[PDB]
Amino acid sequence: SSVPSQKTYQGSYGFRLGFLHSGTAKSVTCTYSPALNKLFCQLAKTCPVQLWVDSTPPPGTRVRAMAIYKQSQHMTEVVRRCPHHERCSDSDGLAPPQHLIRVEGNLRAEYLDDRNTFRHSVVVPCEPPEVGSDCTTIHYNYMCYSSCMGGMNRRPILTIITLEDSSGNLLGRDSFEVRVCACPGRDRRTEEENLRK
Ligand SMILES: COc1cc(S(C)(=O)=O)ccc1NCC#Cc1cc2c(NC3CCN(C)CC3)cccc2n1CC(F)(F)F
Ligand SMILES: [Zn+2]
């Protein structure tokens, strides 16, 4: 399949992502490593992702998420849920059972099967921050473990976040690596310790 770009692009509105500072306690359900540009999360749990701009884009702007394999030899393969999880009948009514990334808590979420590339994505409208807030937040859920055999199969993925106009034209792009695992805090600590060597 075709290769979606992963190149960081702030664009005219100064678009970029932000993450909470959740620490690495054993109980943490989602945690982000700036040093690794890597989000560690548990299966089907809330992953807050912040959206930052220097200036407000137009009404009708949307934000899309898509997963791609990070390694060169796998990037052309569609990232999808594994044979077990795509058959477990756990759709919320919007997400197709094959889709790895869901949006939590937004009834306006839309799911795309690309007719040409067969890649999956989920897109929502974006709005300015609530009163007293400086950014907006999307809550994502990842619906397979990184280790799921016949799906990601222990291969690392990136999530590409794109800011789009109402026609789908590119306004901005950012990305981060993702590991979906049972203990994100320990795994982040381990991978950051490995980095220190
Ligand atoms: C129904 O939706 C809309 C309605 C209107 S409106 C009521 O004027 O009719 C206008 C726009 C939209 N929607 C598109 C959007 C947006 C947006 C603005 C934004 C943001 N603003 C600050 C504002 C202050 N200055 C100094 C820095 C920038 C800070 C952080 C995130 C922000 N976002 C979301 C993002 F990042 F994804 F683009
Ligand atoms: Zn799975």
Experimental method: X-ray
The reply to whether ligand 1 has any atom less than 6 angstroms from the CB of 48 is no
Is 138's C-beta closer than 6 angstroms to any atom of ligand 1?
no
Query: Side-chain half-sphere of 113: how many Cα atoms within 13 Å?
Result: 9
* Residue 70 CB coordination number (10 Å): 16
Q: Which residues make beta-bridge pairs with 122?
A: 65, 111
What is the C-alpha to C-alpha distance for residues 58 and 36, in angstroms, rounded to an integer? 32
Tell me if 88 is assigned to a ligand binding site: no
10 phi, psi to nearest 5 deg: -75, -30
The reply to whether 144 sits in an annotated binding site is yes
Reference 2, options 82, 94, 68, 52; nearest CA is: 68
Q: How far is CA 108 from the centre of its chain?
A: 17
CA dihedral 81, 10, 36, 142 (to 10 degrees): -20
On whether 148 is known to bind a ligand per the annotation, the reply is yes
Supply the residue whose CA is at minimum distance from atom 4 of ligand 1. Answer: 59
C-alpha to C-alpha distance for 116 and 80, rounded to whole angstroms? 16
| Ligand 1 pocket check for 135: Cβ under 6 Å | yes
Sketch the domain layout of the chain as residue ranges. Answer: 16-195
Which residue in 103, 100, 95, 101 sits closest to 81, CA to CA? 100
Reference 4, options 115, 146, 160; nearest CA is 160
- The CB of 56 under 6 Å from ligand 1? The reply is yes
The answer to whether residues 148 and 81 touch, using CB atoms and an 8 Å cutoff, is: yes
- Secondary structure of the chain in the HEC alphabet? CCCCCCCCECCCCCCEEECCCCCCCCCCCEEEECCCCEEEECCCCCEEEEEECCCCCCCCCEEEEEEEECCHHHCCCCCCCCCCHHHCCCCCCCCCCCCCEEECCCCCCEEEECCCCCCEEEEEECCCCCCCCCCEEEEEEECCCCCCCCCCCCCCEEEEEEEECCCCCEEEEEEEEEEECCCHHHHHHHHHHHHCC
Scanning the structure block, which residue is given the tokens 């800011």? 163
Mutation probe of ligand 1 site: the residue of 10, 15, 53, 164 with most atoms within 8 A of C-beta: 53
Beta bridge partners of 110: 123
Residue 89: other Cβ atoms inside 10 A? 6
CA distances from 164 to 59, 112, 161, 167, 168 (A): 11, 14, 10, 7, 5
Give the separation between CA 150 and CA 99, rounded to whole angstroms: 14
Closest C-alpha to 25, from 192, 193, 188:
188
Atom of ligand 1 nearest to the CA of 51: 36
Regarding the beta carbon of 14 and ligand 1, being less than 6 Å apart is answered no
Resolution (A): 1.9
Atom of ligand 1 nearest to the CA of 163: 37
CA 111/CA 101 separation, integer angstroms = 9
Q: Does the annotation list 183 as a binding residue?
A: no
HSE-up of 81 (CA within 13 Å, CB side)? 23
Asked whether the beta carbons of 141 and 47 are under 8 A apart, the reply is yes
Q: How far apart are the first and last CA of the chain?
A: 37
Beta-carbon count within 10 A of 7 CB: 8
Instruction: Let me know if domain 16-195 sits in CATH 2.60.40.720.
Output: yes
Query: Atom 33, ligand 1: which residue's CA is nearest?
Result: 128
Q: Which ligand is nearest to the CA of 161?
A: 1
Q: How far apart are CA 120 and CA 100, in angstroms?
A: 8
User: In what side-by-side order are the strands of the sheet with 47-52?
Assistant: 16-18, 47-52, 136-142, 101-103
Q: Is the CB of 162 under 6 A from ligand 1?
A: no
**Rounded Cα gap, residues 62 and 171, in angstroms:** 10
Which pair of tokens denotes residue 146?
A: 């990184």
